[PDB]
DNA sequence: GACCACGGCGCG
DNA sequence: ACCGCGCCGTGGTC
């Protein structure tokens, strides 16, 4: 039923291709062809044939046009039916998925892709009639949102790689004397990298008690968390807790890095996932960059090397405590609402409270605790964990989460009633109905069913922001376009652009606002907003 | 080499 | 009894 034309394929055809490896940017273009009416078309030359297409619609249309710009060109993502199975289900994540369970295989020709690409499209677009709040979703959100991130990816930011080479000495130096000073300690060298051997010098060479265990191997953890509780035992804690944050980090970030450095750019390139998230949100791949270090010293001089092009400056917008305002919202709770409609900030509070300092003293590092602390007990933390973490009593934690809920009835009121409508129709939704199956919520094993539940009402509001800082960057894109001003990164709830040092400033307040004004709630959005050479004087 | 399950841990 | 991610060594295949 599939016939073989010659290369020059209608308009409006659905695309296939083949890389030599999934990242975009580095990809050799191994194959193209195209897939319209009844026939397939294949180019003998994919790179001359990259040309001729006016648009990329198909599987992973995206990171074809990420290539694309890549070599010059400007074919921008169309339809992509992992978009529209992604609305379906965010289970669907993976071509090899989609094509198992909408109507295909996923092979490793073009032309098989690009017929693939076309009947999925036709099936699961049948599937989303009368699903007009996923259309919505569908062109108003998601295949807009390709094209932002296409451009995003091509573009890439800026790194410090001679800063970045030179605090590698730096810190294998201290990794150095830490892992010598651990080997006294023990009294003998092992793989200090090794979890299993550490177990065997933390609970049988020395006696420290063991404090919880591993889940698939029930191994005794030998987790930061077990570590903190046990950092008076024994001096050899603490230097364990300090040679697990460098190496994390230099092995991580400060040496993969430099290495990832295009030839063509000078740039770092990183993938932005469009349907690898259960809540909507989106994953950064292969250089993950929304996971960069910030919280510690260390971390900081790394997020340091992220630096705008010589005459531009970056711009970091964030939205001010996204979840509870858009909590305060999907719940409707008045005294909640009051908070932001009174200008109050919860983590500020909260972190005031934690460490018996008047607001005006709380840093970002005791902030940053009020925020687990907060969204902790939200989303259902235990008050032993919580006592655990509040370094307080267990009635004291148990308390702090009694007057959390009384202070904003409508929440629990509002958890309950998700859960309940979860139950009953499979799925929970977004403000703008994403939506995500979750059928453990009817498990009989309150273990599990309870683990479901948590899952199931972080969704709604988790998935809500992220709805929003899509649509806040389908609309502010073309505006930055037209200012000559780029965007880099997306940070769940922050973005990262570039603008020429004369138009810093302008951008900066034209950013803050499409990101605002995105689409009004019961609570208004604020975003803070800064601006610097590096990525951390930018926040 | 290339790929995995785990335990861990970076960020949101 | 916080939620959502991806990546990095181990210890182990194949
Ligand atoms: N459950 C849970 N959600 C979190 C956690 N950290 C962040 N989130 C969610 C809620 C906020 C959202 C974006 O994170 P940010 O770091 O931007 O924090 P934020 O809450 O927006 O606040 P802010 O603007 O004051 O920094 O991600 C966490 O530890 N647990
Ligand atoms: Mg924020
Ligand atoms: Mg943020």
């Given at each position: ?63 074809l ?48 892709r ?16 009368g ?40 810190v ?38 063991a404090?919880?265990?591993?889940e ?13 509780a046990?950092?008076?035992?024994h ?7 300090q040679?697990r ?52 010293p ?29 909590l305060?919202?999907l ?19 909260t ?37 655990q ?27 309950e ?39 199931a ?10 709805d929003?800082?899509?649509?806040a ?61 590096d ?5």
């Amino acid at each position: 039923a599939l016939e073989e034309a010659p290369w020059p394929p209608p308009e409006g055809a659905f695309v296939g291709f083949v890389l030599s490896r999934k990242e975009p940017m580095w990809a050799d273009l191994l194959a193209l062809a195209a897939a319209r009416g009844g026939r397939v078309h294949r180019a003998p030359e994919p790179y001359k044939a990259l040309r001729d297409l006016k648009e990329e619609r198909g599987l992973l249309a995206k990171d074809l046009s990420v290539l694309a710009l890549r070599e010059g060109l400007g074919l921008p993502p169309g339809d992509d039916p992992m978009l529209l199975a992604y609305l379906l289900d965010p289970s669907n994540t993976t071509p090899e998925g989609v094509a198992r369970r909408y109507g295909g295989e996923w092979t490793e020709e073009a032309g098989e892709r690009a017929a693939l690409s076309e009947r999925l499209f036709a099936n699961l677009w049948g599937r989303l009639e009368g699903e007009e709040r996923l259309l919505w979703l569908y062109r108003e959100v998601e295949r807009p949102l390709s094209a932002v991130l296409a451009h995003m990816e091509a573009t890439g930011v800026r790194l410090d790689v001679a800063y970045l080479r030179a605090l590698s000495l730096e810190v294998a130096e201290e990794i150095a004397r830490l892992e010598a000073e651990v080997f006294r300690l023990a009294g003998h060298p092992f793989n200090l990298n090794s979890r299993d051997q550490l177990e065997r010098v933390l609970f049988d060479e020395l006696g420290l008690p063991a404090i919880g265990k591993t889940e698939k191997t029930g191994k005794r953890s030998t987790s930061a968390a077990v570590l903190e509780a046990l950092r008076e035992a024994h001096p050899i804690v603490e230097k364990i807790l300090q040679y697990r944050e460098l190496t994390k980090l230099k092995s991580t970030y400060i040496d993969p890095l430099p290495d990832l450095i295009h030839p063509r750019t000078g740039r770092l390139h990183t993938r932005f996932n469009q349907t690898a998230t259960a809540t909507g949100r989106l994953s950064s791949s292969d250089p993950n960059l929304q996971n960069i270090p910030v919280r510690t010293p260390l971390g900081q001089r790394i997020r340091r090397a992220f630096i705008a092009e010589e005459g531009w400056l970056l711009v970091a917008l964030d939205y001010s405590q996204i979840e509870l305002r858009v909590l305060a919202h999907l719940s409707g709770d008045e005294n909640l609402i009051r908070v932001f409609q009174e200008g109050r900030d919860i983590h500020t509070e909260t972190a005031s409270w934690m460490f018996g300092v008047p607001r005006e003293a709380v840093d970002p590092l005791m902030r940053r605790a009020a925020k687990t602390i907060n969204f902790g007990v939200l989303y259902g933390m235990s008050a032993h964990r919580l006592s655990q973490e509040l370094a307080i009593p267990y009635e004291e934690a148990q308390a702090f989460i009694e007057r959390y809920f009384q202070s904003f009835p409508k929440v629990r009121a509002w958890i309950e009633k998700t859960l309940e409508e979860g139950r009953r129709r499979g799925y929970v939704e977004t403000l703008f109905g994403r939506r995500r199956y979750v059928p453990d919520l009817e498990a009989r094993v309150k273990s599990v069913r309870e683990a479901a539940e948590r899952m199931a009402f972080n969704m709604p509001v988790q998935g809500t922001a992220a709805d929003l800082m899509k649509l806040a960057m389908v609309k502010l894109f073309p505006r930055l376009e037209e200012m000559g001003a780029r965007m880099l990164l997306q940070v769940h709830d922050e973005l990262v652009l570039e603008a020429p040092k004369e138009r810093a400033e302008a951008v900066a307040r034209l950013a803050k606002e499409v990101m605002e004004g995105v689409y009004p709630l019961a609570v208004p959005l604020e975003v803070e907003v800064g601006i610097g050479e590096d990525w951390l004087s930018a926040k």
